[PDB]
C-alpha cells in the first residue's frame, strides 16, 4: 500500500509499536529517536517518550544526545582525510609521529608503578590504532593491571585531562599485547584525534567543524553543548535491576556543557539524529552529500573492509566482551564493524553492513547492498543492556518489499 | 510446445515415469504433481487413486496429509513475529519457556532415571528453527531419549496438547548440548507453541489469519471439515515386495476430528493448489497477488545455510539425515538448502530450498531457475523411494532456454 | 580482419605452427583444425596427408579415429536416459547389472587366483561416469588387474562384445574401493552397455537415432562404410627421433569391418564437421538448429567438477592423469573441467571442458569465451606432443575483444 | 569542482604539493615526473624539480629516465608474444631451449668455484623464469654464496658482458632452491630476453623496437640513449644518510649512452613518462592502443593472474626483502605483481592491481577494477628507500569521486 524506496511504511510503523511495547511503556528506556533512510530518502523518523523524565520533557527531532563511541567513525574519517593528502601511511610506526612511544613494551607482570614488560614483536602502527589492534586499552575495561593503571591515572577523563596528557602518560605504560596480535577496544581513537591535531595543526573541534560538520550542514554536533542549546539536551540514564533506570547525567550541570579541555575523538561528541543522519548518508553515498565531500569513495571502501587478520571476526581476535556471540560473523575496519557472515551473526542483514554504537545505546548502520541506513538514539548506559539494535534490524529488514 | 523456457513434451515424461515406475507396478496409490516456472504453472497432473479401497481417483482438489511440509509454514509464522521485534534468534528459549532454563544433556540411564550433564550454553530459538536444539522425535527409535518420547506419546496421543508437549519436554534430557549437532525433532511443534505464546492466538487461527486467508488457501487445515472429507486421500504404508497397505482410512481418520493437538511440525492437510500458492509466494520473495506473508529479506535470511561453518547435514546430523542423499545440502530456518550440486549427485541449482512429508510429499523452489515443484502422494515412509530425485531429473531436463 | 571478436590473421598462426613444428619436420602426417566462437566457424584448415603411403591429402571431409572423444558422446547418450527418470547417479551399478553385486577390491595374487577385500560401498553409476569405479584398462600396463584385462582381451579381440566385457568384469577385482580414487577405465564401455540395457537399442542405433540424425552427423559411426573408405585417414604411431610409422592402414582396417564390439569408450570414426556440430550443440546448452540432444541444465551438471571436495585429477588419479599437465583440471560426467588457469600453466578459462583421443585428437569448449576447438590428427599416443596446449596458446592469443 | 573521468583534479594537485613538501624541498629526491590516467584520459602530468642538480637542469615532460626493472614487464610481454605463436609452453623445461642447463643442481655448501650441490625435485621451467621461482638470483642480493659467485663473475653487468655469457656462466652455477619451491628476485628476466632472441632470431633491441615500441609509438625507449637525446637524460642519484643523495650516474659519460654488448631484459631500458604511459595504457586496454596490438587480451589476463602456488602472496614464498610487510597481500604473475588482499596490504587500491618498479624508484600500476594507472619517475637508488609509491596511491585513490 504505502511504499517509498522499496520500503513498506506500514511495516516500519512496527518500530514505534515495538519501542512502545518493549521499552517505553514498561520503563526500560526514557525515550528514543529513530531514523531510517533508503536510496537517499528518509522513510521513517519518529521521536518517542521523554528526553528528560525528571522535567517531563519529550524527545523531539532536534533533541541532542551523547553519541559517545559513534564519535569514533567521525575521528576515523578525519584521520583518513589526511591519509588522502599523503600525510602518513597505515603501516608506518606510531612512534614516527609520537617519538616518545618508540620504546613501548608489552605487560608481563606487576602493579603500577612497578610493571615489568617484554619486547613487542614489532612497533605499533597507525593501522593498529584505527583497528584497536595496538595493545592500548580503556580504564573502564576493569580486567587487567594495565587498565587499573589507566583508572589510577584517569586516562579516560578527569580534571585537567588533555590529549597531550593522555599521550604523555601512555608513553610510560605497557601494552596488553604485541601490536597487531589481538583486538582490544581502547583509547586508540582518542590517540587518532591527537594525530589529526598533530598533522592538521588544528584542535580536533576546529578540524571536525571545518572539514566535516560545516561541509555536511551539521550545526548541532559539538564536544561542548552551547548554553543556548542546553534546553534541547537529553538526560542520560543508567540501567537498574528489574529492567529500570536512574538519572546518570542531568543535562543542566553536565560536564558536556563545560569546555573542560579534553577533546575525546573516542567518545566526546553530542549530536542529534539529523546531524548523524547527514554523516551516515554522506558515507552511504561514497563520501559526498549535496555537493560536499568529506572522504574519497575509494578511501571509504578501504575503511569498510575487514582489516582483521585472515578475514577473521571479532570473536577470533578480541580479548573482551567483543569476543561474545553477538559479534559472531562481524569484523572491523578503520573505525567501523563489518558484517562478514549473516547466518553466523544470527541477525538479518547483508554482508558489508557497517557502523558502530555508543555506550548510552546509540546505534547506526549502513547496508551498502540494500542502500539502507538507520540512526537510533536513546540514553541508557550501558549499550550491552538490551538487544534493541538487533530488534530494529529485524523490523527494518522485514519492511523491504522489493 | 514451450512455456516459461520449459518443454511441455519433456514434462509429460513425469506422468509416463510415475505410471511405469510406481503406479502400474503398485508401489504408490496415486500422485498429484505440479511444476511452475516464472509464476506460470507449466505442469499439473493427477494420476491413479486417492482411495484404492473405494476406487476413487486422485483429482486436482484431492486433500493430502503433507506432514512435515507443515514445518516451513510454522517457520514463516514464527519469522512473521521476528519481523515485528517479538524475539531474537540468539535469545534463549527459556526466556519464553522459563521451565526449560535447567534442561540438561543425556549421559546415561532409562526413563525415568536418566542422568544428565550441564549443556555448554542454553538452547536458543535459532536452535529450534534449525533442529540443532538437542530435541528429538519418538519415531527416531535410536536412543533412550526417543524411547522416553514414545513412552510419553509426545509425537501424538489421546488428550495430547502443545501445553503437554512443553510441560513433558521440561523434564527430559537433550540428545546433545544445544547447537553442537543436528537432529530432526519436535522443535517445530515448539515453534508452533511459541507462535501461540507470542501472538496470543491458537496456531490454527494464526495460520488462517496471517497465511491461508491472505494467500487464498481455503483447503489447508489441521482438521478436515466434514463437507470436504469426500476429497480426502487414504494414507498407505510400505510393504515388502514394493507394495503398500492401508495406513489411514479418510472416513474415520484422526485428521477429521478436532482433537486438541495443533502440530506445527506435521499436522496440516492441504492440496496441490494451496501448497503451490504458498511455494509461489516464497518464490516471489514472500508476496502473491498483492498479499505478503513475509519480507523478501527475512525469507532470504531463512533460505541461508544456518549450520556452523557452512557445513552440510552429513557433517552435523546424528541420524538418517547424515546419509549420502543429504550430501551437499544444508539447513536454514525450516528449509533444506542445496550447497553443492555435484556432491548431492542430483541435478539442480545452489540454493534449491524446500522440505518433504513422512508420506512422501515433496516441494522445492530453485531461486536460480525461478522453478518450483509440488509433489503429493500418500506412502509412509518418505525414505522408501527416490521419486523426488527422479522428478528433479525430469523437471531439470525440461529446461530448454 | 575480425569475426566474433577473433583476429583471423592471428588464427593463421595455427597453420604456420603445425607446418613449422609438426608437418615439415615429419612429426605428424596431417591435421584438420576447426575453431568456432559464438556459433561462427572462424578457422577451418586441412594440412598435410591423411595417408602418407598413398600420398592422399587431409581434406575437410577426411574421417578420423576419434577414440576416447567417443566418451563424451556415450556420456550424453546415458544422461539422455537420466532426463527420462530411468536411473539416478547414486544408484548402485548392481541394480542394473546384478552379477556385479559382489565385486571386491584387489589385494594380491595373479589371475586367475586374485585375493580381494570388501569395498566400503558398492559401485554407483556416478562412479562409472567419472572413472571413480575402480575399473581399469588393459593398456594401463601398471597392475595385476590390468594384466588380467590383457589376458582376457577386454579392450578388444575377435568375438568380443559388450555382453562379454560385462560377464568377464563380474569376476575381476577393482583397483580400489568405488569412489576413493580416479583411474581411466572401460567404465564408459560399461556406460554404453547401460544405454543398450535401458533403451533396448544397440549402441550404434541409439547414437544414430538420439544424437547423429538430430545433429546432422552423417559421417560418424563404429564401422566406416565401404563407399566412405577412400576418405579414411591412416593411423600413425610415434617412433624415436620425433618420427612416426604406419599403425593402421585404412584399407584393411578393423574400423571397416562390422565386428561385434561397440566401444562407447573408443569405437567411433568421425570427421571435423560432425564433431564440430556435437561440440557446438554442447556450447549452445545442448541444442543446434532446432535439434536438442540434452537439457541445458543436465549439461551444466555434467560440466561440473564431480571429484570429491572440488579436487583436481592429480589429487585423486593413480596413473599418468596425476601428472603436472592435469594440475588445476577436474572431471565431471565425461568431460575434464579447468578449475585453476594459473595452476594448469596453460591459457584458458575456468570451466573449459572437453576430452581427447589416444591418436592425439582433441576438443574443448570454453563457456566463458563461447569458444571451441576441434583438432584431428592420427598419432598414437596422445601423450607424445603438447600440440593441444600450443593450439590453446594461439587460439586464446587471437581473442581481441 | 574540476572532474575528468571521475577523478577530482583539485585532489590530484595534492601530488605536486606532497612531492614538494616531503621529497623535493627537503632534498630527498632530485626531481619527479608523475602521470595519472583513468579510462584512457591523462588526468595528471607534472614535472617537478631537477633532472640534473649539478647542471641545474629541470625535469621536463620529455626527460629520459633509467626505468630499470620496469624493463621486466616489457621483456615479459615480448616472450608471451612468442607464446601466442606456439613457440613454447610455460611448463616446458628451460633446458629444452638451453640444453647445457639440463643438469642445474641446488646449492648445498662451499665457495665458488668449489660449490657442492643436490639434485632438484624437477627441472626449471619457462613459467619459473617468468615468475622468479627458477632458483636463479642476482649479484646485488648480497645474501648467499650463490650471489657471491654472481658478483665474482660480474653476471649483473661488466665490460664485454653479453646475454650469451650470462647463459654460459649460469649453466655452471647452482640454484638457490629446487625450481618452483620458492620465489627469489633474479636474472631470470635477462634469461627471458635471451629466449626472445633465440626464438625470434632477432637481437632484443630490434625485437622490442619492431614488436612493441614502433607499434605503440614509443620513440624515446631504448637500451642506448642516442647522442641527440642525451641533453634530455636525467642524472641518477643514490641515498645518503640524513635523507640526502649523491650523484650516482652523470648522464654525460653514462654507460647508458654507449652501445656496449649487454641487452638486459631485466633492467637495461631508458624511457620517458609518455612512452611508459603508452605501454601501460595499451595493457590497461587489454593489449591494444590506437589500432596497434602488442598482446592478446586473454594472454594478458593470464599474465595478470597470481602464478604463485595455492594463490599465496610473496611473503609466503619469498626468501628476500620481498617477504617483508609491504608485499603482504600481493602475489606475482608473468612479470607483474598482483594485489590479492587490499586490507592485508594496508594500502588503498583494488584486488588485481598490477605493475612493477625500478631500482631507481620508478613505479607504475594499473588498477583494472577502476581503469586507472600511474607512471612515476625519479632517479633515487634504491627503490626500498622511501614509501612515495604508497603515498601516491593514497592521493590518487582519494581523488576517485564517482
Ligand atoms: Cl516496490
Numbering used by the authors:
A (entry chain C), D (entry chain A): 8 to 409
B (entry chain D), C (entry chain B): 9 to 409
The authors write:
Indeed, the analysis of the substrate specificity revealed its capacity to hydrolyse nitrocefin as a model chromogenic cephalosporin substrate (40.4 ± 11.4 units·g−1), and a large battery of 66 structurally different esters (up to 1730 min−1), including bis(2‐hydroxyethyl)‐terephthalate (241.7 ± 8.5 units·g−1) and the mycotoxin T‐2 (1220 ± 52 units·g−1). It also showed acyltransferase activity through the synthesis of benzyl 3‐oxobutanoate (40.4 ± 11.4 units·g−1) from benzyl alcohol and vinyl acetoacetate.
Structural analyses of free and substrate‐bound forms of this homooctamer esterase suggest that EH7 presents a more opened and exposed S1 site having no steric hindrance for the entrance of substrates to the active site, more flexible R1, R2 and R3 regions allowing for the binding of a wide spectrum of substrates into the active site, and small residues in the conserved motif Y‐X‐X containing the catalytic Tyr enabling the entrance of large substrates.
